[PDB]
Short mmCIF file of C-alpha atoms and ligand atoms in Angstrom, two decimals:
data_model
loop_
_atom_site.label_atom_id
_atom_site.label_comp_id
_atom_site.label_asym_id
_atom_site.label_seq_id
_atom_site.Cartn_x
_atom_site.Cartn_y
_atom_site.Cartn_z
CA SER A 1 217.51 -147.28 -38.29
CA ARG A 2 219.44 -149.76 -40.47
CA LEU A 3 220.35 -153.14 -38.98
CA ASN A 4 222.80 -154.63 -41.47
CA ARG A 5 226.05 -155.93 -39.77
CA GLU A 6 228.09 -152.82 -40.52
CA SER A 7 225.50 -150.50 -39.00
CA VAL A 8 224.98 -152.62 -35.87
CA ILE A 9 228.80 -152.66 -35.34
CA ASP A 10 229.04 -148.93 -35.94
CA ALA A 11 226.49 -148.37 -33.23
CA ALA A 12 227.92 -150.92 -30.81
CA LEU A 13 231.39 -149.31 -31.09
CA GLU A 14 229.88 -145.91 -30.41
CA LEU A 15 228.07 -147.50 -27.46
CA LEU A 16 231.30 -149.09 -26.23
CA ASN A 17 232.96 -145.69 -26.05
CA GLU A 18 229.97 -144.41 -24.05
CA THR A 19 229.66 -147.30 -21.58
CA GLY A 20 232.88 -149.36 -21.62
CA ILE A 21 232.88 -153.13 -21.86
CA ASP A 22 231.27 -154.02 -18.49
CA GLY A 23 228.48 -151.57 -19.19
CA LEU A 24 227.75 -152.46 -22.78
CA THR A 25 224.50 -154.51 -23.02
CA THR A 26 222.32 -155.66 -25.83
CA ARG A 27 219.48 -153.81 -24.18
CA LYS A 28 221.29 -150.42 -24.46
CA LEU A 29 222.31 -151.21 -28.02
CA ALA A 30 218.58 -151.75 -28.92
CA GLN A 31 217.85 -148.41 -27.29
CA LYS A 32 220.57 -146.72 -29.24
CA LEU A 33 219.29 -148.21 -32.44
CA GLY A 34 215.57 -147.30 -31.79
CA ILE A 35 214.37 -150.84 -31.73
CA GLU A 36 212.91 -153.40 -29.43
CA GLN A 37 215.00 -156.17 -27.99
CA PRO A 38 213.51 -159.02 -30.00
CA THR A 39 214.26 -157.05 -33.18
CA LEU A 40 217.89 -156.81 -32.03
CA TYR A 41 217.99 -160.62 -31.20
CA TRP A 42 217.29 -161.47 -34.85
CA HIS A 43 220.52 -159.62 -35.71
CA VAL A 44 222.72 -160.10 -32.64
CA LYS A 45 222.12 -163.09 -30.36
CA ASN A 46 223.96 -161.95 -27.16
CA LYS A 47 226.75 -159.82 -25.83
CA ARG A 48 229.39 -162.52 -26.42
CA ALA A 49 228.60 -162.53 -30.11
CA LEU A 50 228.63 -158.76 -30.25
CA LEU A 51 232.03 -158.57 -28.52
CA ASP A 52 233.42 -161.34 -30.78
CA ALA A 53 232.43 -159.23 -33.81
CA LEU A 54 233.76 -155.99 -32.28
CA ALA A 55 237.16 -157.54 -31.61
CA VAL A 56 237.47 -158.56 -35.23
CA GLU A 57 236.16 -155.33 -36.60
CA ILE A 58 238.28 -153.10 -34.50
CA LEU A 59 241.40 -154.71 -36.09
CA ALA A 60 239.93 -154.78 -39.55
CA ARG A 61 239.13 -151.06 -39.40
CA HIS A 62 242.13 -149.66 -37.64
CA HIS A 63 245.00 -152.21 -37.54
CA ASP A 64 246.68 -151.02 -40.69
CA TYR A 65 250.02 -152.86 -40.30
CA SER A 66 249.11 -156.55 -40.09
CA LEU A 67 251.20 -157.61 -43.17
CA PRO A 68 254.89 -156.89 -43.84
CA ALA A 69 255.99 -154.60 -46.61
CA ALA A 70 257.91 -155.98 -49.62
CA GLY A 71 261.41 -156.68 -48.39
CA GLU A 72 260.90 -155.47 -44.80
CA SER A 73 262.99 -157.12 -42.11
CA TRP A 74 261.40 -159.25 -39.36
CA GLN A 75 262.59 -156.68 -36.77
CA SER A 76 260.97 -153.88 -38.59
CA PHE A 77 257.80 -155.93 -39.16
CA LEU A 78 257.36 -156.82 -35.54
CA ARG A 79 257.98 -153.18 -34.55
CA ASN A 80 255.46 -151.70 -36.94
CA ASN A 81 252.95 -154.47 -36.20
CA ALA A 82 253.20 -153.96 -32.49
CA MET A 83 252.71 -150.23 -32.86
CA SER A 84 249.67 -150.75 -35.13
CA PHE A 85 248.15 -153.32 -32.77
CA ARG A 86 248.62 -150.96 -29.82
CA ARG A 87 247.05 -148.09 -31.72
CA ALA A 88 243.99 -150.10 -32.69
CA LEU A 89 243.50 -151.41 -29.20
CA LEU A 90 243.69 -147.87 -27.84
CA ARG A 91 241.18 -146.37 -30.25
CA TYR A 92 238.04 -147.62 -28.36
CA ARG A 93 237.35 -147.70 -24.65
CA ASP A 94 238.32 -151.07 -23.15
CA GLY A 95 239.58 -152.14 -26.54
CA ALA A 96 242.13 -154.44 -25.04
CA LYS A 97 239.54 -156.11 -22.90
CA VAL A 98 237.32 -156.49 -25.97
CA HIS A 99 240.27 -158.07 -27.79
CA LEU A 100 241.14 -160.47 -24.95
CA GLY A 101 237.69 -162.02 -24.49
CA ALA A 102 237.32 -162.92 -28.25
CA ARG A 103 238.62 -165.79 -30.66
CA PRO A 104 241.20 -165.68 -33.64
CA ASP A 105 238.39 -165.40 -36.25
CA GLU A 106 238.23 -167.30 -39.58
CA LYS A 107 238.18 -163.87 -41.34
CA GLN A 108 241.77 -163.22 -40.00
CA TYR A 109 243.17 -166.83 -40.14
CA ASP A 110 245.04 -166.00 -43.31
CA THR A 111 246.49 -162.81 -41.90
CA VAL A 112 247.98 -164.57 -38.86
CA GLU A 113 249.01 -167.46 -41.08
CA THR A 114 251.01 -165.16 -43.33
CA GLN A 115 252.72 -163.58 -40.30
CA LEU A 116 253.76 -167.01 -39.09
CA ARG A 117 255.05 -167.98 -42.55
CA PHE A 118 256.95 -164.70 -42.79
CA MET A 119 258.77 -165.35 -39.44
CA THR A 120 259.64 -168.80 -40.66
CA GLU A 121 260.87 -167.54 -43.98
CA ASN A 122 263.31 -165.32 -42.01
CA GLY A 123 264.96 -168.09 -40.05
CA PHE A 124 262.66 -168.81 -37.15
CA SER A 125 261.31 -172.27 -36.54
CA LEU A 126 257.52 -172.25 -36.32
CA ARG A 127 257.90 -172.49 -32.57
CA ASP A 128 260.13 -169.53 -32.24
CA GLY A 129 258.30 -167.40 -34.68
CA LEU A 130 255.14 -168.14 -32.74
CA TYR A 131 256.74 -167.33 -29.39
CA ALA A 132 258.13 -164.11 -30.77
CA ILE A 133 254.79 -163.08 -32.10
CA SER A 134 252.97 -164.16 -28.91
CA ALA A 135 255.46 -162.31 -26.61
CA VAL A 136 254.94 -159.13 -28.66
CA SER A 137 251.17 -159.54 -28.53
CA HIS A 138 251.17 -160.23 -24.77
CA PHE A 139 253.55 -157.37 -23.94
CA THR A 140 251.49 -155.03 -26.03
CA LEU A 141 248.11 -156.22 -24.62
CA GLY A 142 249.50 -155.95 -21.08
CA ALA A 143 250.74 -152.43 -21.60
CA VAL A 144 247.52 -151.33 -23.16
CA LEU A 145 245.37 -152.96 -20.55
CA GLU A 146 247.24 -151.15 -17.81
CA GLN A 147 246.98 -147.82 -19.66
CA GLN A 148 243.18 -148.25 -20.18
CA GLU A 149 242.48 -149.71 -16.73
CA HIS A 150 244.38 -146.84 -15.27
CA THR A 151 240.93 -145.12 -15.49
CA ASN A 152 252.14 -140.03 0.91
CA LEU A 153 254.35 -142.00 -1.59
CA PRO A 154 258.00 -143.20 -1.19
CA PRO A 155 260.53 -141.14 -3.24
CA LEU A 156 261.47 -143.41 -6.18
CA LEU A 157 257.90 -144.64 -6.53
CA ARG A 158 256.82 -140.98 -6.19
CA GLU A 159 259.13 -140.17 -9.02
CA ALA A 160 258.23 -143.50 -10.73
CA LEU A 161 254.47 -142.65 -10.64
CA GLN A 162 255.33 -139.12 -12.00
CA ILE A 163 257.60 -140.56 -14.64
CA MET A 164 254.94 -143.29 -15.32
CA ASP A 165 252.20 -140.66 -15.88
CA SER A 166 254.38 -138.34 -18.07
CA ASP A 167 252.90 -139.40 -21.41
CA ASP A 168 250.47 -142.08 -22.59
CA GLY A 169 252.85 -144.99 -21.74
CA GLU A 170 254.20 -144.70 -25.28
CA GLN A 171 257.81 -144.28 -24.04
CA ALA A 172 257.82 -147.30 -21.69
CA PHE A 173 256.06 -149.32 -24.43
CA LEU A 174 258.56 -148.46 -27.13
CA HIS A 175 261.56 -148.99 -24.93
CA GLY A 176 260.31 -152.48 -23.96
CA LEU A 177 259.49 -153.23 -27.51
CA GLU A 178 263.09 -152.71 -28.61
CA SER A 179 264.31 -154.76 -25.72
CA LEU A 180 262.13 -157.67 -26.68
CA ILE A 181 263.03 -157.47 -30.41
CA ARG A 182 266.81 -157.39 -29.62
CA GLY A 183 266.33 -160.35 -27.28
CA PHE A 184 264.66 -162.29 -30.15
CA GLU A 185 267.51 -161.41 -32.49
CA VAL A 186 270.17 -162.48 -30.02
CA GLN A 187 268.34 -165.87 -29.82
CA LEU A 188 267.82 -166.23 -33.60
CA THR A 189 271.47 -165.48 -34.38
CA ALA A 190 272.93 -167.87 -31.77
CA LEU A 191 271.54 -171.05 -33.53
CA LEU A 192 273.04 -173.93 -31.46
CA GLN A 193 275.70 -171.91 -29.45
CA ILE A 194 275.36 -171.46 -25.74
CA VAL A 195 274.05 -167.98 -25.26
CA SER B 1 230.43 -166.51 10.70
CA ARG B 2 233.41 -164.24 11.50
CA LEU B 3 233.68 -160.91 9.68
CA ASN B 4 237.17 -159.68 10.51
CA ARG B 5 239.16 -158.60 7.33
CA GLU B 6 241.04 -161.89 6.98
CA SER B 7 237.86 -163.96 7.08
CA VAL B 8 235.96 -161.73 4.63
CA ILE B 9 238.93 -161.98 2.20
CA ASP B 10 239.16 -165.74 2.67
CA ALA B 11 235.53 -166.03 1.68
CA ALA B 12 235.69 -163.55 -1.18
CA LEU B 13 238.66 -165.44 -2.70
CA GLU B 14 236.75 -168.69 -2.43
CA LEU B 15 233.81 -166.89 -4.05
CA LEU B 16 236.05 -165.54 -6.80
CA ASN B 17 237.09 -169.06 -7.75
CA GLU B 18 233.41 -170.04 -7.87
CA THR B 19 232.09 -167.09 -9.89
CA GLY B 20 235.01 -165.29 -11.57
CA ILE B 21 235.44 -161.54 -11.45
CA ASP B 22 232.39 -160.44 -13.52
CA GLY B 23 230.18 -162.68 -11.41
CA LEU B 24 231.50 -161.81 -7.99
CA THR B 25 229.02 -159.52 -6.14
CA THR B 26 228.72 -158.27 -2.63
CA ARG B 27 225.29 -159.84 -2.52
CA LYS B 28 226.72 -163.37 -3.15
CA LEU B 29 229.49 -162.75 -0.66
CA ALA B 30 226.83 -161.93 2.04
CA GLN B 31 225.09 -165.17 1.10
CA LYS B 32 228.29 -167.11 1.39
CA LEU B 33 228.98 -165.60 4.76
CA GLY B 34 225.41 -166.19 6.15
CA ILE B 35 224.64 -162.56 6.65
CA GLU B 36 222.41 -159.84 5.38
CA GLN B 37 223.65 -157.22 3.01
CA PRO B 38 223.66 -154.30 5.44
CA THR B 39 225.79 -156.40 7.81
CA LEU B 40 228.27 -156.90 4.94
CA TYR B 41 228.22 -153.10 4.09
CA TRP B 42 229.59 -152.27 7.56
CA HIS B 43 232.63 -154.40 6.66
CA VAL B 44 232.95 -154.02 2.88
CA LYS B 45 231.50 -150.94 1.18
CA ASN B 46 231.30 -152.16 -2.48
CA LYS B 47 232.82 -154.48 -5.02
CA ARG B 48 235.58 -152.01 -5.95
CA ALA B 49 236.83 -152.01 -2.39
CA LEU B 50 236.63 -155.78 -2.20
CA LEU B 51 238.61 -156.20 -5.44
CA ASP B 52 241.19 -153.60 -4.30
CA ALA B 53 241.75 -155.69 -1.15
CA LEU B 54 241.83 -159.00 -3.07
CA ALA B 55 244.50 -157.71 -5.45
CA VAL B 56 246.72 -156.80 -2.54
CA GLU B 57 246.07 -159.94 -0.61
CA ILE B 58 246.60 -162.28 -3.46
CA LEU B 59 250.21 -160.96 -3.76
CA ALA B 60 250.76 -160.85 -0.04
CA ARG B 61 249.70 -164.49 0.33
CA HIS B 62 251.23 -166.09 -2.70
CA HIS B 63 253.82 -163.78 -4.34
CA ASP B 64 256.80 -165.16 -2.49
CA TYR B 65 259.58 -163.58 -4.60
CA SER B 66 258.99 -159.83 -4.38
CA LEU B 67 262.46 -159.01 -2.86
CA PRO B 68 265.88 -160.04 -4.20
CA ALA B 69 268.08 -162.47 -2.35
CA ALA B 70 271.38 -161.32 -0.80
CA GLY B 71 273.78 -160.87 -3.69
CA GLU B 72 271.38 -161.95 -6.46
CA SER B 73 271.90 -160.41 -9.88
CA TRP B 74 269.28 -158.11 -11.46
CA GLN B 75 268.75 -160.70 -14.23
CA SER B 76 268.09 -163.40 -11.76
CA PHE B 77 265.85 -161.12 -9.69
CA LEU B 78 263.66 -160.12 -12.57
CA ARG B 79 263.39 -163.77 -13.65
CA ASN B 80 262.37 -165.10 -10.27
CA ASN B 81 260.07 -162.12 -9.66
CA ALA B 82 258.31 -162.57 -12.95
CA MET B 83 257.79 -166.26 -12.30
CA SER B 84 256.43 -165.54 -8.78
CA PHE B 85 254.11 -162.81 -10.07
CA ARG B 86 252.80 -165.13 -12.78
CA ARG B 87 252.22 -167.91 -10.28
CA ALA B 88 250.28 -165.69 -7.90
CA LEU B 89 248.15 -164.27 -10.66
CA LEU B 90 247.32 -167.77 -11.84
CA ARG B 91 246.32 -169.12 -8.44
CA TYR B 92 242.77 -167.59 -8.46
CA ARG B 93 240.26 -167.37 -11.27
CA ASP B 94 240.57 -164.06 -13.12
CA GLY B 95 243.49 -163.16 -10.91
CA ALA B 96 245.07 -161.04 -13.57
CA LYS B 97 241.88 -159.12 -14.09
CA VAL B 98 241.62 -158.63 -10.32
CA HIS B 99 245.20 -157.34 -10.34
CA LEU B 100 244.66 -154.95 -13.27
CA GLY B 101 241.61 -153.12 -11.91
CA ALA B 102 243.31 -152.28 -8.52
CA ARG B 103 245.90 -149.58 -7.20
CA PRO B 104 249.64 -149.96 -5.99
CA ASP B 105 248.58 -150.07 -2.30
CA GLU B 106 250.32 -148.24 0.59
CA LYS B 107 250.93 -151.70 2.20
CA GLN B 108 253.23 -152.59 -0.80
CA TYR B 109 254.78 -149.12 -1.49
CA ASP B 110 257.95 -150.16 0.26
CA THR B 111 258.20 -153.43 -1.62
CA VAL B 112 258.03 -151.72 -5.03
CA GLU B 113 260.29 -148.98 -3.74
CA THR B 114 262.98 -151.48 -2.80
CA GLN B 115 262.73 -153.12 -6.24
CA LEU B 116 263.26 -149.76 -7.89
CA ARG B 117 266.23 -148.97 -5.63
CA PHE B 118 267.71 -152.40 -6.33
CA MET B 119 267.58 -151.82 -10.16
CA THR B 120 269.22 -148.48 -9.65
CA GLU B 121 271.89 -149.90 -7.42
CA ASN B 122 272.77 -152.27 -10.32
CA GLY B 123 273.38 -149.60 -12.92
CA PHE B 124 269.96 -148.63 -14.21
CA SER B 125 268.78 -145.06 -14.11
CA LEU B 126 265.44 -144.77 -12.33
CA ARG B 127 263.83 -144.48 -15.74
CA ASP B 128 265.32 -147.60 -17.11
CA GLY B 129 264.86 -149.63 -14.03
CA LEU B 130 261.23 -148.60 -14.06
CA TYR B 131 260.78 -149.46 -17.73
CA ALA B 132 262.42 -152.81 -17.20
CA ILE B 133 260.19 -153.60 -14.31
CA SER B 134 257.07 -152.30 -16.11
CA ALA B 135 257.85 -154.30 -19.33
CA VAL B 136 258.22 -157.47 -17.24
CA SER B 137 254.98 -156.76 -15.40
CA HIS B 138 253.08 -155.98 -18.62
CA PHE B 139 254.44 -159.00 -20.51
CA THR B 140 253.59 -161.23 -17.59
CA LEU B 141 250.08 -159.74 -17.07
CA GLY B 142 249.40 -160.04 -20.81
CA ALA B 143 250.44 -163.66 -20.94
CA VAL B 144 248.43 -164.53 -17.91
CA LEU B 145 245.37 -162.67 -19.05
CA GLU B 146 245.39 -164.56 -22.33
CA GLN B 147 245.86 -167.90 -20.54
CA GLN B 148 242.94 -167.19 -18.13
CA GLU B 149 240.67 -165.60 -20.74
CA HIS B 150 241.29 -168.58 -22.92
CA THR B 151 238.34 -170.02 -20.90
CA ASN B 152 238.95 -175.62 -40.61
CA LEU B 153 242.29 -173.89 -39.66
CA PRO B 154 245.28 -172.98 -41.93
CA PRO B 155 248.34 -175.27 -41.45
CA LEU B 156 250.84 -173.16 -39.48
CA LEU B 157 248.09 -171.65 -37.36
CA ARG B 158 246.70 -175.21 -37.00
CA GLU B 159 250.07 -176.26 -35.76
CA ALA B 160 250.46 -172.90 -33.92
CA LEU B 161 247.15 -173.45 -32.01
CA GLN B 162 248.29 -177.07 -31.22
CA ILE B 163 251.72 -175.88 -30.18
CA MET B 164 250.02 -172.96 -28.28
CA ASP B 165 247.77 -175.37 -26.31
CA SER B 166 250.58 -177.90 -25.53
CA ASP B 167 251.15 -176.81 -21.93
CA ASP B 168 249.90 -173.97 -19.72
CA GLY B 169 251.72 -171.24 -21.74
CA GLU B 170 254.68 -171.71 -19.42
CA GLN B 171 257.08 -172.39 -22.35
CA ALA B 172 256.10 -169.34 -24.42
CA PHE B 173 256.19 -167.24 -21.21
CA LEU B 174 259.65 -168.36 -20.18
CA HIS B 175 261.10 -168.02 -23.64
CA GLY B 176 259.81 -164.42 -23.89
CA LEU B 177 261.02 -163.68 -20.45
CA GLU B 178 264.62 -164.52 -21.37
CA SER B 179 264.32 -162.51 -24.52
CA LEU B 180 263.19 -159.45 -22.63
CA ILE B 181 265.87 -159.81 -19.91
CA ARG B 182 268.67 -160.17 -22.55
CA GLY B 183 267.29 -157.13 -24.36
CA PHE B 184 267.51 -155.13 -21.09
CA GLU B 185 271.09 -156.29 -20.54
CA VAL B 186 272.15 -155.38 -24.06
CA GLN B 187 270.76 -151.85 -23.36
CA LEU B 188 272.31 -151.53 -19.87
CA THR B 189 275.76 -152.59 -21.08
CA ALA B 190 275.83 -150.26 -24.12
CA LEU B 191 275.82 -147.02 -21.97
CA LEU B 192 276.25 -144.23 -24.58
CA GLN B 193 277.31 -146.40 -27.63
CA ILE B 194 275.05 -146.74 -30.61
CA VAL B 195 273.42 -150.10 -30.27
C1 LIG C 201 251.62 -159.73 -33.59
N1 LIG C 201 250.36 -159.02 -33.99
C2 LIG C 201 249.83 -158.39 -32.75
C3 LIG C 201 249.44 -159.99 -34.70
C4 LIG C 201 248.41 -159.21 -35.48
O1 LIG C 201 248.83 -158.01 -35.83
C5 LIG C 201 247.13 -159.66 -35.78
C6 LIG C 201 246.40 -159.21 -36.99
N2 LIG C 201 245.15 -159.64 -37.16
O2 LIG C 201 246.94 -158.44 -37.78
C7 LIG C 201 246.48 -160.55 -34.81
O3 LIG C 201 245.38 -161.16 -34.94
C8 LIG C 201 247.26 -160.64 -33.54
O4 LIG C 201 247.21 -159.34 -32.93
C9 LIG C 201 246.70 -161.69 -32.64
O5 LIG C 201 245.85 -161.29 -31.66
C10 LIG C 201 247.05 -162.99 -32.79
C11 LIG C 201 246.33 -163.95 -32.00
O6 LIG C 201 245.60 -163.58 -31.12
C12 LIG C 201 246.58 -165.40 -32.25
C13 LIG C 201 246.07 -166.43 -31.35
O7 LIG C 201 245.33 -166.11 -30.24
C14 LIG C 201 246.37 -167.75 -31.64
C15 LIG C 201 247.12 -168.10 -32.75
C16 LIG C 201 247.63 -167.15 -33.61
C17 LIG C 201 247.40 -165.80 -33.40
C18 LIG C 201 247.92 -164.78 -34.37
C19 LIG C 201 249.10 -165.35 -35.16
O8 LIG C 201 246.90 -164.50 -35.38
C20 LIG C 201 248.21 -163.47 -33.62
C21 LIG C 201 248.62 -162.39 -34.60
C22 LIG C 201 248.71 -161.05 -33.87
C1 LIG C 202 258.00 -156.72 -11.32
N1 LIG C 202 257.08 -157.33 -10.31
C2 LIG C 202 255.94 -157.90 -11.07
C3 LIG C 202 256.75 -156.31 -9.24
C4 LIG C 202 256.21 -157.02 -8.02
O1 LIG C 202 256.66 -158.26 -7.91
C5 LIG C 202 255.32 -156.48 -7.11
C6 LIG C 202 255.29 -156.89 -5.69
N2 LIG C 202 254.35 -156.37 -4.90
O2 LIG C 202 256.09 -157.72 -5.27
C7 LIG C 202 254.33 -155.51 -7.62
O3 LIG C 202 253.51 -154.83 -6.95
C8 LIG C 202 254.34 -155.46 -9.12
O4 LIG C 202 253.88 -156.74 -9.58
C9 LIG C 202 253.47 -154.35 -9.62
O5 LIG C 202 252.21 -154.66 -10.00
C10 LIG C 202 253.95 -153.09 -9.70
C11 LIG C 202 253.01 -152.06 -10.02
O6 LIG C 202 251.90 -152.35 -10.38
C12 LIG C 202 253.47 -150.64 -9.97
C13 LIG C 202 252.65 -149.55 -10.50
O7 LIG C 202 251.42 -149.78 -11.05
C14 LIG C 202 253.17 -148.26 -10.43
C15 LIG C 202 254.41 -148.00 -9.88
C16 LIG C 202 255.21 -149.01 -9.39
C17 LIG C 202 254.79 -150.33 -9.42
C18 LIG C 202 255.66 -151.41 -8.84
C19 LIG C 202 257.12 -150.95 -8.79
O8 LIG C 202 255.29 -151.63 -7.44
C20 LIG C 202 255.42 -152.72 -9.60
C21 LIG C 202 256.19 -153.85 -8.96
C22 LIG C 202 255.77 -155.18 -9.59
CL1 LIG C 203 217.46 -152.86 -41.66
CL1 LIG C 204 226.85 -154.78 -43.69
CL1 LIG C 205 223.60 -157.99 -22.53
CL1 LIG C 206 263.49 -153.20 -42.67
CL1 LIG C 207 232.58 -161.02 13.48
CL1 LIG C 208 241.78 -159.90 10.29
CL1 LIG C 209 228.28 -155.97 -6.17
CL1 LIG C 210 272.30 -164.38 -9.58
MG1 LIG C 211 244.96 -161.89 -29.97
MG1 LIG C 212 250.62 -153.96 -11.00
#
């Protein structure tokens, strides 16, 4: 079949949904594509390189809210961005694991950059903007990982574990997300006051 | 050598630090212990079972702040608990990954339970206590995973990536942790007011 980048990634994503991250191999990708392994090697040098590309592509394809709208607030931006990031990570099997093992690609540099400039333009120091953005990313990645890796009791925990498996985790995610955002705002507004 | 539970786990933890999670195998554990594989199988049935036990043991050994002190506030408890949980997850290679893939063990049921009762005894509904505790756990797991898996630029990002690799991640972690805790308190205090 065709072995241009876009096609190889299409097939590897399809493969990822079939096998998950641990079970994805270049050998099975060759098989899926109808080719021999040394043919694949010309195109894709190893699993690490494949996963690096999948991490970038998964965001490029599906992470629709990386940039703020004209005039949007920083609260609203972080909210929408977190929800988009969560959604994209959920779309493929082990997507958060794929995301974690990879590097902040040159092809996205300018996206991140803009997000950091945006925070700063709304009153955060670089440091605080970064921390805000990192806390959101880590909270979101954590919540998704636990959702995806989720694949006799005491009473509270019995009702916790029922409550906990009542939807996708969307409720607990969204509730935490507001908590975090309000905590950032309380910090931003305080300036040099003891808070 | 000796193949009682405690010894097998000692050796598997030592092995985990040598190989990481992907590279830990029952075969290499047998090797480390000076035994044949079928001897190991009597004791440990597969990797999944090994990892399940390591996840529990890593907390039991090293997670010193699972229960609140007499009279401690819920803010203080969550803070200390998060820091303890982070510390324990960091102690072994891929510790957060080991933690994620495992299940909330019967041997800890009563620890979690108590934490959930404690939140509730301080004014949270079960739901909110749970969410608070889950957001902390997910934020912490996310931050640790990214620390552990962390193993030409634009300016801000250049200074972000320098700032970001200035310590262990302890600063960004602790700053987010306070944000989250304050966000929980703002929610708890508001009751039925629009907030
Ligand atoms: C908050 N939200 C989840 C952000 C986002 O939506 C991204 C995007 N491409 O649209 C990320 O890459 C984003 O999701 C993301 O993963 C970001 C990063 O990983 C990093 C790392 O590791 C180091 C320095 C800077 C960044 C970053 C500023 O680009 C991060 C931006 C993250
Ligand atoms: C907040 N802090 C990190 C808590 C903790 O310190 C624990 C401990 N053993 O001391 C956990 O097990 C704790 O770290 C932890 O992982 C908890 C859990 O995973 C769960 C899951 O998955 C489902 C229901 C309930 C729990 C829980 C209440 O036991 C969680 C308690 C977590
Ligand atoms: Cl071709
Ligand atoms: Cl292409
Ligand atoms: Cl491979
Ligand atoms: Cl807005
Ligand atoms: Cl023995
Ligand atoms: Cl023993
Ligand atoms: Cl194995
Ligand atoms: Cl206190
Ligand atoms: Mg990232
Ligand atoms: Mg857990």
